[PDB]
């Protein structure tokens, strides 16, 4: 996996290509590289 993807999925949620996460989710830093945002 990219770099931080495994970090966020180690929690509970998913990674999206967007800087606005659908609710209920929070923008947890960055997922794959700096392209995807972590939604947990």
Curated annotation (Swiss-Prot):
Subcellular location(s): the record lists: Secreted; Cytoplasmic granule
Which tissues express it? Detected in outer membrane of the vitelline layer of the egg (at protein level). Expressed in the liver, gall bladder, kidney, testis, ovary and male and female reproductive tracts. Expressed in the ovarian stroma, but not in the ovarian follicles. No expression is detected in bone marrow.
Q: What is the effect of changing residue 13 to R?
A: In strain: Huiyang bearded
Q: Which domain of life is it from?
A: Eukaryota
From the record, give the transmembrane residue ranges: none
- Tell me the disulfide pairings in this chain: 8-38, 15-31, 21-39
Q: Which family does it belong to?
A: Belongs to the beta-defensin family.
Q: What does this protein do?
A: Has bactericidal activity.
Q: Write down what this protein is called.
A: Gallinacin-11
Q: Which organism is it from?
A: Gallus gallus
Q: What fragment of the whole protein does this chain represent? A: 23 to 62 of 104
């Amino acid at each position: 996996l990219p770099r931080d993807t495994s970090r966020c999925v180690g929690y509970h949620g998913y990674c999206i290509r967007s800087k606005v996460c659908p609710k209920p989710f929070a923008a947890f830093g960055t997922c794959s590289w700096r392209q995807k945002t972590c939604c947990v």
